[PDB]
Amino acid sequence: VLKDAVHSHAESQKVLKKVSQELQTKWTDWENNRGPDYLLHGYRVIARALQQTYTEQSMLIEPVPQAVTVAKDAVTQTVRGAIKNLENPKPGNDPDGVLMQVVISLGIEGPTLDPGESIQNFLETRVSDFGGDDSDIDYTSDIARLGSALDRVRENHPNEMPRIWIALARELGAAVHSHATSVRIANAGKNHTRDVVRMANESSRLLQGMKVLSVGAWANTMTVLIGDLFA
């Protein structure tokens, strides 16, 4: 390589760990001290990232196999399950957000995953990440249906994946907005929209920089933020 780029890669590795640590210290201070505003800034960042995959994947769109229609049906079914688990649980269960946390991770991170990792492996990894291995609900059939439908499309015709990301991102973005207003109204008298907007802009510029530097590092930091949302 150029000597020059090899030196810049090391400098980038150092900047990357500094930004990750600064993000997590900012978020721990904000969650600790700024209460509900922290959660609302979280939803704002998540909504922005979903809008990002919505627009970028919309740019990529240039007969369409049945596997695509099956994948679209699997994402609506699974997102429905995620929201039901979170906001209208069965009699005898408590609200559970991990399925929502994993499908949001998929909407945000899925388009930039390495081809070598299957969607099914991604989903299982993030169920583990969000503490879902010790839970009350079985996510097995939900994540199975999503993972198999999406991996069928990703193996047979990856160039068709945008149609799925688009539909996933759009629906999730709407669900986030609806849910954010519920949290916001629940905290009437304590909301500071100026601080939410500022916090969301700081977080987003640091996360976007991190994403250009290392998509896996960005995805792990995003996992931390998403873990604080959806109860």
Transcribe 177-215 into DSSP letters: HHHHHHHHHHTTTS--HHHHHHHHHHHHHHHHHHHHH-H
Q: Report how far residue 126's alpha carbon sits from residue 138's, in angstroms, rounded to the nearest whole number.
A: 14
Q: For the chain, how many structural domains are there in total?
A: 1
Q: How far is CA 112 from CA 30, 54, 157, 183, in A?
A: 29, 13, 16, 30
Method by which the coordinates were obtained = X-ray
Q: Could you count the other beta carbons within 10 Å of the beta carbon of residue 63?
A: 4
Which pair of structure tokens corresponds to residue 52?
């990002």
Q: What is the DSSP letter of 112?
A: G
Integer Rg of the chain from CA? 18
Give the distance, in angstroms, between the CA of residue 21 and the centroid of all CA atoms in the same chain: 20
Q: Which residue range is the domain that position 104 belongs to?
A: 3-227
Q: How far apart are CA 78 and CA 99, in angstroms?
A: 9
Tokens coding 59: 């740019």
Let me know the angle formed at the C-alpha of 53 by 218 and 55, rounded to the nearest 5 degrees: 140
Q: Angle at which helices 36-60 and 193-213 pack, to 10 degrees?
A: 50
Q: What is the resolution of this structure in A?
A: 2.1
Nearest Cα neighbor of 121 from 134, 138, 109 is 109
Dist. CA 68–CA 56, nearest whole Å: 19
Does the CA dihedral 123-130-173-51 come out positive or negative?
A: negative
